[PDB]
Nucleic acid binder design. Structure first.
Lengths: 129, 83, 217, 149, 101
RNA sequence: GCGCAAGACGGACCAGAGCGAAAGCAUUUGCCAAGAAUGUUUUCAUUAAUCAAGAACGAAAGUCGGAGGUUCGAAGACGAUCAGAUACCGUCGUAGUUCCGACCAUAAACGAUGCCGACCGGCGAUGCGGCGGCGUUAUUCCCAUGACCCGCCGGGCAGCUUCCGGGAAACCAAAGUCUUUGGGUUCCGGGGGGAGUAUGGUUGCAAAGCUGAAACUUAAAGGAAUUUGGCGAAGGGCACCACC
RNA sequence: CCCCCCCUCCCGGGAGAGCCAUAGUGGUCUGCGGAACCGGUGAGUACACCGGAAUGAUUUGGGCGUGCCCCCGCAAGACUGCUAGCCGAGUAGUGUUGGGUCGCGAAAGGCCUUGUGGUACUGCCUGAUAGGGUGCUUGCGAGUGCCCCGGGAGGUCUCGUA
């Protein structure tokens, strides 16, 4: 069955971006999805993304601008340190001028650069470039 | 389609699709009321009965259980209620 | 095309559309021609919207007159139905015709005598004539298509919804396209139409040439 | 997909988004509560109770006219049986299958379906034991076929 | 006289039909077989041999079959394919003379 | 040609059709029991997915006990073929083939492709259930009923096409969404022989099933496709160094 | 006499359940007002009565399916089955798919203006001028031909013959 809705959402938006659709659909919704899509829109890979709310299971409509290449998910839920994220970004990111690493810290869902400038770290959600 | 807008299409598009593929989630069946031509009391019945039902006063049976919607007794007046 | 006032359809163009039979389609339905078919009538026939047809005709005519070299646009015909239409259209506007056995060594082979690379290509139908589409794929060359509801759409920039089974419909559509491109270029003024003959582009079967030869002097 | 069938299905109820009392219906809570009381003392299972209410009395669902479901009302009165209805039906089906297989000896697929429904009974039994509605000394055997019918 | 009447039936393809399959469900065939057996056993148990044979020289049983069975699924070809006799009564001469006149 | 008697099997109807977990399943009728899908504004509320221990079922052939064994037919018997056949061929022919029990758990038991779940295109069909809509058929007017036709919905065997994409290519709408490498999970393999061999354990009355080596040799053994081959392969044309 | 016949062409008389229509003709729909709102009474469908309430006194016909259904009067329109003058009459008889207002269906007898213009044909056959079976043809496929009675003329219709 389905036990990782975030991996399915990221794979669906990756497939629909690679085909070239403008508005996509995600059948689950969660806190992690909506904060991940807000940090997506803040760093500027998507546009105005919508969400429908009901009493059963909300769905998310995401506008696309084509500014994404590939957007994967670390599974299972690994943990990193501050002396460790450089090892991840050297062998995972395509470059150091772009490509971001998102991670869950004590202050919430956030990317690795402001985690480096704020000096805290934790479990890692996924990646996008 | 490339820029297919899934925010608000025509209502025929949500009509032709499935009850669960619809982006706003709502079923298709409804409630109804129907009487006997030789009586005064009128009762309400669901569109899919699944049990045989007779009108109150124990005069004449009203619906019949089918695979789909319940077929009504011949010669009965009805109208769909909505809110 | 539809933003201005004079560019909308006239009153006799609807009459010519209904007389020539430019509204009925085939039997099946494609998945790219869904936005031009409005509603399926009886006998398994789908109806194109004529406002969409006139609008895309205006857009295609604008794309044709956009270039400043009249001898750089090319028209292609394969079947024997539409032959005189593209020839007299190239005589009027200034285009270059290829009618009957489009040779595959034109746009790619650069040593042959029949080597001419155009800027715009106008095909009669993609399904009946698909060889210039594949060769137009190999060079910077857009295509203009007069496609039906059963014709597949591929490598097409501007698609014209058409009923390309009758010769009168294709000839009258070519007549209106030539009329629009000469009005847009600046030869015939918009305030007066030049509508003297639409039968210049009409093709008739080889019975009627002998019949009209015996009827006329 | 199903947990014994090879195929996958899609057939279930679908409540609408509109969480409100129907304005056309004029019914209180006490009359429908004593209707639950009467139809429960007549000797019927709560699924059929919900079916007969939404069939005859025109109620959408009880949760939209009250703040609780059927079994909570029945345990508030205390007329809810000590055995759950789905487990009771599964045990009755297993008893019927074993009774048929007592006289029909060479029947392999019926024995396989008996194994499948015993697996279903075992899974529901472990669930009902770990959610503290049945005592841990309870256990289903063949000799309990006349005990919990 | 004890007989064993056999019957056969084939379904009819409509002129408007485009589907080439044209089969029938098992319960349809079961109910058609039940109606066919009841109609065929009704016309024989009530009369003697001569009368049911005189009804059998034209197609009267078959005309009843495509009269009564077209309401469930249209069928066109029913003949009584075989009639088999099993037992006869005690041999006499008046019956033999009265079948000849 | 007419009767009697025994055993086996249910053709044509039968299809790139149905059902079942698979092995498999076709005379009608009567009884019992189970189940997919469809529909649902009914109920419990996380009961979920895959699985070492352990368990059920399992074509034929094989062994133990029976009534009864048509036809076919291992081993065998007798003749022709053949330089030589104890092979192909023909006639007999035991055990077997069918039923009731008692067992081993082996196939190319192969879709040579694990299960669940999400996503990415189209076309036209068939099967089930539901749904809307012209017009015909069950004595000529209505209703839903069975059938005919036009569209829609869900699950399953699918067919055609597709520079979506993948692959060494055959090919695949999954064998895809993979160096731009991470959804969950069970079994399983590292050049080829030795060898599924010997020993040991295990089950079995019985054949064998499961588990499963070592020494030594070896630089190839293998998979896809192309170019004229070469075919007691098919289909055309020619020659008196071929024929009439 | 080419004939017992029979067939074809030309010309008339009779039934029909085709179209535009006439006399008796039955219903559906298209708008307007029930002075205006809130409940009780009695087993019956759209009924009667009251109690609240607006100017001492006087009032609105109802239903429970909250929005259209009955009972009225006005305004005329679109569609509609049978009969051939009407009652008899949709009447015996007539049907298996199941009922319904239920198809087709004469009469006997009686009574009154004393009973329709234009317009095609008709292979037996079950159910019509419809649906559904189904021919002859130059042997092969096809354009024409095929109801009862009467008069004249003729006696080998055609397109190519695997």
């Amino acid at each position: 069955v389905r036990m990782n809705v975030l991996a399915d959402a990221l794979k669906s938006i990756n497939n629909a971006e690679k085909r070239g659709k403008r508005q996509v659909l995600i059948r689950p919704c969660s806190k992690v999805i909506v904060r991940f899509l807000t940090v997506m829109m803040k760093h500027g890979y998507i546009g105005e993304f919508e969400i429908i709310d009901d009493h059963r299971a909300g769905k998310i409509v995401v506008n696309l601008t084509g500014r994404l290449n590939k957007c994967g998910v670390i599974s299972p839920r690994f943990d990193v340190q501050l002396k460790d994220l450089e090892k991840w970004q050297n062998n995972l990111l395509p470059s150091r001028q772009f490509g971001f690493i998102v991670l869950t810290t004590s202050a919430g869902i956030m990317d690795h650069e402001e985690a480096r400038r704020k000096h805290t770290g934790g479990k890692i959600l996924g990646f996008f470039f | 389609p490339l820029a297919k807008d899934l925010l608000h299409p025509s209502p025929e598009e949500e009509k032709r699709k499935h009850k669960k593929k619809r982006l706003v989630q709502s079923p298709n069946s409804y409630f109804m009321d129907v009487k006997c031509p030789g009586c005064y009391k009128i009762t309400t019945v669901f569109s899919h009965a699944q049990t045989v039902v007779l009108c109150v006063g124990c005069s004449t049976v009203l619906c019949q259980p089918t695979g789909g919607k319940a077929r009504l007794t011949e010669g009965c007046s009805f109208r769909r209620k909505q809110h | 095309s539809g933003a201005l006032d004079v560019l909308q359809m006239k009153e006799e163009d609807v009459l010519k559309f209904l007389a020539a039979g430019t509204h009925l389609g085939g039997t099946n339905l494609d998945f790219q021609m869904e936005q031009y078919i409005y509603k399926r009538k009886s006998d398994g026939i789908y109806i194109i919207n004529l406002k969409r047809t006139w609008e895309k005709l205006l857009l295609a005519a604008r794309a044709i007159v956009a270039i400043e070299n009249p001898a750089d646009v090319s028209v292609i015909s394969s079947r024997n139905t539409g032959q005189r239409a593209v020839l007299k259209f190239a005589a009027a506007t200034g285009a270059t015709p290829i009618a009957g056995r489009f040779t595959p060594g034109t746009f790619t082979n650069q040593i042959q005598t029949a080597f001419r690379e155009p800027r715009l290509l106008v095909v009669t139908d993609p399904r009946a004539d698909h060889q210039p589409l594949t060769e137009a794929s190999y060079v910077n060359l857009p295509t203009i298509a007069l496609c039906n509801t059963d014709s597949p759409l591929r490598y097409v920039d501007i698609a014209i919804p058409c009923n390309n089974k009758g010769a009168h419909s294709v000839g009258l559509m070519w007549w209106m396209l030539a009329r629009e491109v000469l009005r847009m270029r600046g030869t015939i003024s918009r305030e007066h139409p030049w509508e003297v003959m639409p039968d210049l582009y009409f093709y008739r079967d080889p019975e009627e040439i002998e019949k009209e030869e015996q009827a006329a002097a | 997909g199903r947990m014994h069938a090879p195929g996958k299905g899609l057939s279930q109820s679908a409540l609408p988004y509109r969480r409100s009392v129907p304005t056309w219906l004029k019914l209180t809570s006490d009359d429908v509560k004593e209707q639950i009381y009467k139809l429960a003392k007549k000797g019927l299972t709560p699924s059929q109770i919900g079916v007969i209410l939404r069939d005859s009395h025109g109620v959408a669902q009880v949760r939209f006219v009250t703040g609780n479901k059927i079994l909570r009302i029945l345990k508030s009165k205390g007329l809810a049986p000590d055995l759950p209805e789905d487990l009771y039906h599964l045990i009755k089906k297993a008893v019927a299958v074993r009774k048929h297989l007592e006289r029909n000896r060479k029947d392999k697929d019926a024995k396989f379906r008996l194994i499948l429904i015993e697996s279903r009974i075992h899974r529901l039994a472990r669930y009902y034991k770990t959610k503290r509605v049945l005592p841990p000394n309870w256990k289903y055997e063949s000799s309990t076929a006349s005990a919990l019918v | 006289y004890l007989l064993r009447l056999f019957c056969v039936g084939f379904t009819k393809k409509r002129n408007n039909q485009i589907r080439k399959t044209s089969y029938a469900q098992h319960q349809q065939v079961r109910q058609i077989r039940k109606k066919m057996m009841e109609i065929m056993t009704r016309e024989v148990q009530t009369n003697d041999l001569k009368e049911v044979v005189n009804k059998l020289i034209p197609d009267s049983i078959g005309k009843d079959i495509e009269k009564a069975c077209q309401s469930i699924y249209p069928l066109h070809d029913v003949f009584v394919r075989k009639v088999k006799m099993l037992k006869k009564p005690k041999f006499e001469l008046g019956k033999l003379m009265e079948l000849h006149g």
